[PDB]
Amino acid sequence: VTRYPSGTRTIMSPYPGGPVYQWLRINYNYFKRYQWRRVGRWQMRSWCYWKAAFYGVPEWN
Amino acid sequence: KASTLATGKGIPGIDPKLPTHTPPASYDVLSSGKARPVQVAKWPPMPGGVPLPK
Amino acid sequence: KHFFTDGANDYVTGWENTPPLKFPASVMKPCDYSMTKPIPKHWKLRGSGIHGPENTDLMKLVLWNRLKQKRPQREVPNINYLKDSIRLELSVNWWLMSCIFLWGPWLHWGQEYQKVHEQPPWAMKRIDGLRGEGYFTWFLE
């Protein structure tokens, strides 16, 4: 069984799709995973309201 | 299952050897030996079952 | 369930008053010694006799309530539990569907009818000569 990169090939049809379709599917997959989600990762890690409460507190030995 | 009266032995539909219903099975030859006549209708049934003269 | 209850929906600590039913009684049983037979007079009290970890069942309850917190896999609950966990969520979603596909259509029809006949289709046409749409909930008139 051939395994394609995640999110790049549809399982709904034996036909992979036409050029425009493939472009839309590949590029949405890239935009979500490597462009849009930059904002979410940035907010989750660099601006955590709960991490900021423990800023400057000694480590727990 | 249905190995004892408590488990359901002898209860139709609950016992594997007893069917829920017992409709008569179809036959293709009459008991006389004649072939079973076959009729195909193209009009709804007569109102009272009233037979029509030969 | 959403709200935390120490007795039933205790998800903060996961404490359970009784052991799992899967365990044999010889392995673990609920802490209940109310049926203990009368103590012979020649027996002497060694322990405190105080309700606590000296009792085997209570000890095992405490031990299990801490060692159950690490498990190799999930204990899949049945579909009845899963439905109850998100009962409100599913019901609100169906409420949204009703508001879009039931409330939406007849509300639109009423406004369109109101445009032509001045009053909604579920109201009594007036003859007083006053102007405007008037009431909408006719059963609260």
């Binding site: - | - | 439905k83 009703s98 409330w103 009423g110 579920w122 059963f139």
Partner: protein, 80 residues
Amino acid sequence: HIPHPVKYVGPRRYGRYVYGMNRPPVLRQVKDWIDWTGWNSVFGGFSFQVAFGLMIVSGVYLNNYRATHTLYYTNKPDNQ
């Protein structure tokens, strides 16, 4: 609560999705889904809107049509 069994009697698995082959009819699938996720939420969620809509729209006949022929002092025309 009262411990009870799972009431879902439909098909537990359709098999692996192979380009949508060997699958039930769409309406059968919708019914199986609601069976799997519970009809109590469907009835509970839609109940409020159904009640409100039935009452308001019922006025089309109970409050408007009937009323047109309800006033007993209206059928009488003047100078007749």
